[PDB]
Structures are given as structure tokens and as C-alpha cells.
């Protein structure tokens, strides 16, 4: 069934599963035409497919050329997401194939279900969590590869860097979602907090600074305070 607060811990059991998010697949800037009308110009996007235990993020890059000559792009984008998720599952052998795909938006269910008639042992599920994966493009490293790409391309990342040498999957995932929640609510503040201390390096092969445990605790607190505050600034409390 649906994935919610209650069956939270299942995402960290032995089963190797993926989360698919499609909110950054179809991206447009909206501008004005000479005649005074409004037109959209597409820019590159990605599917955000992630193993929440290891953190491996199969970033599929969606080149604006895939939209060319096509109608009803918001609807196509979800069928495109489903074709690309399907192709990924089709490259991996049976043992290597994941056990459950959880789509972060309910509109993806039928698209994927249809593009997975070929794999009957992989359950497609929705979730009732408001997961912040759309803030994925606030991660500089990931934004840059998407914007620079010249062709369809798949890139491999581990979104937890080396965190799993020291903390658990559960703990790695709570940190990631706190970071992404911060980023979504007020990106500038979120980013300030991450780069404040110049001594801490964002090594080229990392999205996230190489904090110590103690620095992660301080960082994590500061993100909490941010998330709390933007809620007040928005509802006045």
C-alpha cells in the first residue's frame, strides 16, 4: 500500500528499493514574446531515482531535445520518467533488480505500472510523505551536470557521500531529508549554513562538506532552526 509515517522503517530493510521523483523532469523558464505574449523555453532536467539505503542516486539527465515537436509536455514527462525507470530496471539482471519502486507523486503510478508489465515482481507504490526531493537541483554538483549536458546521459552519485561508514541508513536518510527540506524552504539560508566555515571543504567528488560528527550536529540543528523559522515568517507565529 501507500508509504507513510507508520511503515517508515521498511525503507531500510534488506530489500534494495528505489524512490522515483519526477518534479525536475520538465523545466521551463517563462518569458515574453515580442508581440507581448508569453512563451516557455525548456531547460535540461533529470529523473531523481535513489536507493535510500546505500544512497546511490541514478541521476538520469533529460535533455531538452526530447521535448522537440511534442505536445502536452507535462503529461509526456511522466511517461518519459516511466520509460527511463523501466530502461534502468531492464539493464539490471533479476537478482540486481530492485524489490519496490515508490513514486513521490501519485500521477506517476499508472505511467510506471504500464511501463512495468515486463517486471511482475516489482510493486509500484505511492507515499503520503511530502518528501523534499524537488530541492535536488539546489545541490550545486547535481545542478551543474544537468545544465551542462549536451545529450541524454545517466550519471551515478552516492547522495550520502561516505556517511555510511559512520552512521546508519536511517540516520543518513533523515539527514538528507532535513538538508533538502532546508534547501527547499529558503535556499539562500540553507546554503549559507553549509558553506559558512571556509575550512570545511566540499571536495570536488562530494555534494556535501566533510563535516565531523560534531559539526554535523551543529549543522543539523541550524537547519532545524531554519525550517522552524521560515514556517513562522510564512504564517506569523
Partner 1 sequence: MNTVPFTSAPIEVTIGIDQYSFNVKENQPFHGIKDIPIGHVHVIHFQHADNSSMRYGYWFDCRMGNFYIQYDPKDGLYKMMEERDGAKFENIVHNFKERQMMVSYPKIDEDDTWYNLTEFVQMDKIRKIVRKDENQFSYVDSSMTTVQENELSDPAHSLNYTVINFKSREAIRPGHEMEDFLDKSYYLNTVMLQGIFKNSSNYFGELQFAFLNAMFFGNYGSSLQWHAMIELICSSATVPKHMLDKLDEILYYQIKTLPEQYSDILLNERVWNICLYSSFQKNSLHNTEKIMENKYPELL
> Under the rule (CB under 8 A), what is the footprint of partner 1?
76, 79, 82-83, 110-111, 113-115, 117-118
Q: Which residue has the cell 525550517?
A: 227
Q: Distance between CA atoms of 119 and 196, rounded to whole angstroms? A: 47
User: Cβ closer to ligand W4L: 99 or 106?
Assistant: 99
* Residue 209 contact among partner 1, ligand W4L, none, beta carbon within 5 to 8 Å by kind: none
Shortest distance in whole angstroms from residue 49 CB to partner 1? 18
* Residue 16 contact among partner 1, ligand W4L, none, beta carbon within 5 to 8 Å by kind: ligand W4L
Shortest distance in whole angstroms from residue 116 CB to ligand W4L? 13
User: Cβ closer to ligand W4L: 10 or 197?
Assistant: 10
SS3 27: strand
Q: Which cell goes with 54?
A: 546505500
* Residue 195 contact among ligand W4L, partner 1, none, beta carbon within 5 to 8 Å by kind: none
User: Cβ closer to partner 1: 85 or 136?
Assistant: 85
DSSP 144-184: HHHHH--S-EEEEEETTTTGGGTS-HHHHHHHHHHHHHHHH
Q: Which cell goes with 129?
A: 510523505
User: Cβ closer to ligand W4L: 35 or 95?
Assistant: 95
Q: Which cell goes with 137?
A: 537541483
User: Cβ closer to partner 1: 115 or 181?
Assistant: 115
Taking each helix axis from N to C terminus, what angle separates 187-195 and 213-235, rounded to the nearest 10 degrees?
Answer: 160
- Candidates 78, 67, 69, 79; CA nearest to 28 is 67
* Residue 98 contact among partner 1, ligand W4L, none, beta carbon within 5 to 8 Å by kind: ligand W4L
- Whether the CB-CB separation of 96 and 85 falls below 8 Å is answered with no
* Residue 51 contact among ligand W4L, partner 1, none, beta carbon within 5 to 8 Å by kind: ligand W4L
Amino acid at each position: 500500500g501507500a508509504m507513510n509515517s507508520s511503515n517508515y522503517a521498511e525503507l531500510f530493510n534488506n530489500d534494495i528499493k528505489l524512490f522515483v521523483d519526477d518534479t525536475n523532469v520538465y523545466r521551463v523558464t517563462v518569458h515574453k514574446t515580442f508581440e507581448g505574449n508569453v512563451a516557455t523555453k525548456a531547460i535540461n532536467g533529470c529523473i531523481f531515482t535513489l536507493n535510500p539505503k546505500t544512497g546511490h542516486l541514478f541521476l538520469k539527465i533529460i535533455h531538452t531535445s526530447v521535448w522537440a515537436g511534442q505536445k502536452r509536455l507535462s503529461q509526456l514527462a511522466k511517461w518519459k520518467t516511466a520509460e527511463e525507470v523501466s530502461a534502468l530496471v531492464r539493464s539490471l539482471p533479476k537478482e540486481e533488480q530492485p524489490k519496490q519502486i515508490i513514486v513521490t507523486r501519485k500521477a506517476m503510478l499508472d505511467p510506471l505500472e504500464v511501463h512495468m508489465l515486463d517486471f511482475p515482481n516489482i510493486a509500484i507504490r505511492p507515499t503520503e510523505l511530502r518528501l523534499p526531493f524537488s530541492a535536488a537541483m539546489s545541490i550545486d554538483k547535481l545542478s551543474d551536470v544537468v545544465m551542462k549536458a549536451t545529450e541524454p546521459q545517466m550519471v551515478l552519485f552516492n547522495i550520502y557521500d561516505d556517511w555510511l561508514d559512520r552512521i546508519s541508513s536511517y540516520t543518513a536518510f533523515s539527514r538528507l531529508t532535513l538538508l533538502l527540506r532546508a534547501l527547499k524552504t529558503n535556499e539562500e539560508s540553507a546554503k549559507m549554513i553549509l558553506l559558512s566555515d571556509p575550512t570545511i571543504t566540499i571536495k570536488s567528488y562530494h555534494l556535501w562538506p566533510s563535516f565531523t560528527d560534531e559539526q554535523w550536529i551543529t549543522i543539523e540543528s541550524q537547519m532545524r532552526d531554519l525550517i522552524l523559522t521560515e514556517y513562522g515568517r510564512k504564517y506569523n507565529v
